[PDB]
Symmetry: C2
Subunit: 53 residues, 2 copies
Amino acid sequence: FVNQHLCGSHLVEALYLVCGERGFFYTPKDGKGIVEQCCTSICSLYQLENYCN
Amino acid sequence: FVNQHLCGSHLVEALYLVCGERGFFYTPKDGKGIVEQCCTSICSLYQLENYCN
């Protein structure tokens, strides 16, 4: 589920599942950060975990 | 949708909808913070917005 384009609720759901009890932050401002890496381009587990706490 | 018990993906979905382009942080550790206020007890818009960035 992580090796695809993930936007909006789909991206937050992936963060929630990957990060588990660590939690996470979702900062979409200006379509930068996670949006650029996982929504506009193909996401990866490596990149998602950069947004776990 | 915010004035109920919200746990797990249900809580992250509410944060996503309420916080919009501001984004948010989801920190469930030890069932404290947001979990205590919105999952174990009834959530509120006021409390959810405390976790928008």
